[PDB]
Paper text:
To better understand the entry mechanism, we obtained the complex structure of KSHV [name] bound to [name] [name] at a resolution of 3.2 Å and the complex structure of [name] [name] bound to [name] [name] at a resolution of 3.0 Å. Overall, the structures of these two complexes were similar: both were shaped like elongated rods, about 150 Å in length and 30–55 Å in width. Surprisingly, the [name] of [name] bound to [name] [name] with ~4.12 μM affinity, which was ~230-fold lower than the affinity with which the [name] bound to KSHV [name] (~17.5 nM affinity). Notably, the KSHV gL residues (V22, Q30, S32, T70, E72, and N128) that form hydrogen bonds with [name] are widely distributed across the four regions, whereas the [name] gL residues (W24, K68, V75, S77, and R78) that form hydrogen bonds with [name] are only located in two regions. Furthermore, KSHV [name] forms ten hydrogen bond interactions with [name], compared with only six hydrogen bond interactions between [name] [name] and [name]. Structural comparisons between the ephrin-A1–[name] complex and the [name] [name]–[name] complex show that the [name]-[name] [name] and [name]-ephrin-A1-binding interfaces overlap. Over half of the residues responsible for ephrin-A1 binding are also used for [name]–[name] binding. This result suggests that the binding of viral [name] to [name] would preclude the binding of [name] to its ligand ephrin-A1. We compared the structure of the [name] [name]–[name] complex with that of the [name] [name]–gp42-E1D1 complex, and found that the interfaces partially overlap. Thus, the antibody E1D1 competitively bound to [name] gL, inhibiting the interaction between [name] and its receptor [name].
Residue numbers in the entry:
A (entry chain I): 27 to 151, 161 to 200
B (entry chain A): 20 to 674
C (entry chain B): 24 to 132
Amino acid sequence: KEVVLLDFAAAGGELGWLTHPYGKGWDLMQNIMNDMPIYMYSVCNVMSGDQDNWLRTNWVYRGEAERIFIELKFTVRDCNSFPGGASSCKETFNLYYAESDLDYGTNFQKRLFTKIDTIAPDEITVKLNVEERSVGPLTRKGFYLAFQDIGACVALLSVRVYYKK
Amino acid sequence: LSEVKLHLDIEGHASHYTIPWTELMAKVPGLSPEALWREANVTEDLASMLNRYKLIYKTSGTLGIALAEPVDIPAVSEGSMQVDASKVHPGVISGLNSPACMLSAPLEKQLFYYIGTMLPNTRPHSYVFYQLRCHLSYVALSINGDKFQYTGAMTSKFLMGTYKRVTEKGDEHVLSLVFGKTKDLPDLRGPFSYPSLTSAQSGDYSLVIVTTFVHYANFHNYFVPNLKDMFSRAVTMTAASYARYVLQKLVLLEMKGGCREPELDTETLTTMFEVSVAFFKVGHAVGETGNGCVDLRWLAKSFFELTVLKDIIGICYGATVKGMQSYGLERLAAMLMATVKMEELGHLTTEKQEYALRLATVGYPKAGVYSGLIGGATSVLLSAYNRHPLFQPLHTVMRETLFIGSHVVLRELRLNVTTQGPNLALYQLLSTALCSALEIGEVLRGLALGTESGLFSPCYLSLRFDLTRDKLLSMAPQEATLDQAAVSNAVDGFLGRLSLEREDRDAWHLPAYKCVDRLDKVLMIIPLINVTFIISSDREVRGSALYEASTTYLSSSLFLSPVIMNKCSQGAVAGEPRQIPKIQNFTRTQKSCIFCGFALLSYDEKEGLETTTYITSQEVQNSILSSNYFDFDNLHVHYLLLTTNGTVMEIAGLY
Amino acid sequence: WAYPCCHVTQLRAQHLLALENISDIYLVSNQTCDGFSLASLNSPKNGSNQLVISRCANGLNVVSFFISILKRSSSALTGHLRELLTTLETLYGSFSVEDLFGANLNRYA
Ligand SMILES: *[C@@H]1O[C@H](CO)[C@@H](O)[C@H](O)[C@H]1NC(C)=O
Ligand SMILES: *[C@@H]1O[C@H](CO)[C@@H](O)[C@H](O)[C@H]1NC(C)=O
Ligand SMILES: *[C@@H]1O[C@H](CO)[C@@H](O)[C@H](O)[C@H]1NC(C)=O
Ligand SMILES: *[C@@H]1O[C@H](CO)[C@@H](O)[C@H](O)[C@H]1NC(C)=O
């Protein structure tokens, strides 16, 4: 069975995720898709170069989990549909986490997050990509997830964490 | 409000602009973006948008044809007084001959004074156009018992005629034509483009049709316009010429039964659009000169034609015209009519004669019905009748000049009473003298074909009442090249145009009219100075005297009753009628005007009255005598002579 | 932007922004969306989370709106403001509405 520790898309969701830098990075959005607001975090700085844009989750209590499974849903608009491609445009973004026993609140610090993998969509071109990664063993009271942008044109739609019991 | 930045990807990457609402919205009050934002259904699903785009009729094709714009308004005259139509000061212009143009900036403000809705929110326009409200002018009419309606609504930039019909059940079939410069056409709203809706285009002009495919089907049953010619006629002609073109159609039509009960055919609906264009082209050429100045002579002509066109559209369809009238021009024109001695207008060149008569009718609204304009039209006719070879059909140039001056006079006969008895009854007498068998000949020909000759003739405002159908048939063109049906028609219209009743521009204005018992038995009425004569077959007449020529033993009668000092009597003179005293002791060579102010009638014992001449000058007398006019070879034709003393005298021979 | 191609549907009550709370409008291109003239209306930022409310708009409509706004207010027309008008007209002229018949319109959402 799957026990959900975090689900961005659903259920009265995002409510607090941290952006760094404040304003010039990831952007929170709202747009009715079937008839309803589905919220998303997106950033497309594809022509400004040297982009280090962070999005940090709220604090997630570990519970019993040894290994969590991180489910990501996202679109990635390719660089070719921006004329000046392969110069300052990327088509990946980086997934990190950081374990903590305590809630550090808003005090985000980027030299304390470890990278998990590079997220690539496996079909760059309706094409809502679904990537899943697992991290373990988790050994603290809880953890954070963080999303690094290096200059891609990305929209995160669903971020779902669970463990198998 | 706020301000809005537009980020738009074009050429592959972002270009952003900023729309200031606050700033824009204060510089042009009357802008309501939130009302426009509503009119544009911005959350329209592409399904609903494409369905409504396929509701509007699209045009086949038929792209550009080389049409030449004419030269309508001339460049300002050499050293001209530029007149501000708002500030119309007295003395600004001294004379007719003085050059003058009227500033086109404040003139258009007066033509287009109205503000109303140009683009409604009614079903056919709510789909294609963004609603509009602007300074405009409209002709509007109603036929078929306020069921089929037309409104030609125009600005200085583009014209929109909109046809509408009601089907006894609520439905409304609507079709609109849009004419004007392409860049000056109103803003389209949906996915629409003008090339899909253009029915004709030439060199910055276009004719746009806007209607439903459904409504297009309805109209095609009774309205198949030649939109190519309507575009080519509307672009290539000058504003004045085109205006005359329309008013001739309506004037000739009206003499037929074409306006007592107008039909829903192609022609009548077409002319409805042509009517609107005629007003548009004038207001267009004025507005389209920008800030400038428009030659007063051009204005004198173009707006003359609009005044006469406005009139005929009212007495024919019952149409209303709001706008295209400027009080500045009416004041300016009336000023120049106090410059002119109406007693001697006929002494001017026949171009300034026409330039004065055109200002006379442009300036009538604020001139008064006791202005001496009547004498001016009477003067022109006299100078014309002196230089006219007797009994001949009027020339092209003369007939046009008299037509211009005639409208003034027709606003006396079609005006209950007057104070111009001397000049009016003189104009009506010279008109009775001008129209002979050959003048009628060229009019019927000019009517049968449709040319300018049938538009106007002095016979139309003359005193002849003996013009029965078969009387005219003995004067019609007999050439096989003409159509006898058109010639048969041409007689009726010509006979319809003089029928005393239900016309109201013929009679009941002379004080001698009272002494006639039967008003249908009159034949001809010659007013001279100090006497009028009442020639009729009617016996019971209160004239002073009474004469009977030996008419024949076929025809009813020929009586001649001279009314003295335009005062009738208390009962028909009794006893066997008098005898016309014959005259043989009279020589053909004269050196004096003894017959001045005398009419010289010429009739036939079977046919009836044939020719009338009023001897106004020594020249008119020399023509009669020196020519072959006196032909006694035919015994059936006698030559009466109507004096100012009230005596009728037959000339049977000469020396 | 980061999600250009949306689906236009009538908000149909009480979800509007109505252009008093619109501050940015994105217009897709002739090649960006396979020929669909789509727009996205946005708010400046809301509250703590700083979210930008976005609805999907019919491009051809919204384009023709600004075009008429400019024409209607032709006097003021600052140099770039009238360079928008000609950019908008050409952009509107770049899309074909007769190519929208041989297509599916629910391709998105
Ligand atoms: C807007 O479009 C919808 C279809 O999406 C239509 O039902 C509605 O009548 C339109 N609104 C107006 C004011 O025309
Ligand atoms: C009219 O007649 C009177 C007398 O009969 C005469 O004195 C007068 O001069 C006449 N008028 C004209 C214009 O001939
Ligand atoms: C943003 O919206 C929230 C409600 O979702 C409200 O609490 C907040 O005051 C808004 N921010 C403003 C009005 O600046
Ligand atoms: C795209 O736009 C260009 C001009 O910007 C035009 O030439 C081309 O035909 C357009 N493509 C289509 C499929 O209409």
